[PDB]
Amino acid sequence: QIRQNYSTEVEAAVNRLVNLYLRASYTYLSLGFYFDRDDVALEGVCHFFRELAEEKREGAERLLKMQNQRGGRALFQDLQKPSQDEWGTTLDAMKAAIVLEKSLNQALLDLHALGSAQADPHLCDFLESHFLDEEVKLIKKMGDHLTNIQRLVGSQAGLGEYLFERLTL
């Protein structure tokens, strides 16, 4: 058929990466609606996490498209529900979001390493152009938010959270 220089190991890892992205998307949808509760009511934080949900979903779809293009076979698994039902403060949420992005990034780097080992340049390029740079920029942005949240919730935690949501997000 069309399949060429595309190892079963890469195929399998691509499928696992699809699962991680759809799970991240699901986590971010839960984060977003949490911040939209009447007893939380931080619209800007809700909007930030809903954007991220969409981004992660796009990520998965690009992976799935790439899987088809290489002649791999997509295989879907159960999507585990997010690790929490309530996400605490903006501070807690942004910490959990960075932890999540780091673990996506690590999976991207593992796939890239596998790609190199197998001499699969097309895999490596595709991750490079579409995933690795974006993750880096996103993680930088989240780190910056985290610094600003922390500096604001020194004293006057409630005031700090409100001001962050209003003037940054």
Per the annotation, binding residues for Fe cation are 51, 54-55, 58, 61
Q: Which stretch binds ligand [O] (CB under 6 A): 7-15, 47-55, 116-124, 160-168?
A: 47-55
Taking CB under 6 A as the rule, does residue 61 contact ligand [O]?
no
Closest separation in Å from C-beta 16 to Fe ion: 15
Collapsing DSSP to helix, strand or coil, 156 comes out as: coil
139 binds, among its own copies, Fe ion, ligand [O], none (CB under 5 to 8 A by kind): its own copies
Collapsing DSSP to helix, strand or coil, 1 comes out as: coil
Place of tokens 């962050």: 164
**Closer by beta carbon to its own copies, 17 or else 70:** 70
Whole-number Å distance between alpha carbons of 31 and 107: 22
Among 5, 37, 41, 58, binds ligand [O] (CB under 6 A): 58
Whole-number Å distance between alpha carbons of 34 and 11: 35
Closest separation in Å from C-beta 55 to ligand [O]: 6
Residue 99, token pair as written in the block: 């932890």
Given a contact cutoff of 8 angstroms between Cβ atoms, the answer to whether 48 and 98 are in contact is no
Question: Phi and psi (nearest 5°) for 39?
Answer: -95, 10
Footprint on this chain of Fe ion (rule: CB under 5 A) = 54, 58, 73, 85-86, 124, 128
Footprint on this chain of ligand [O] (rule: CB under 6 A) = 43, 51, 54-55, 58
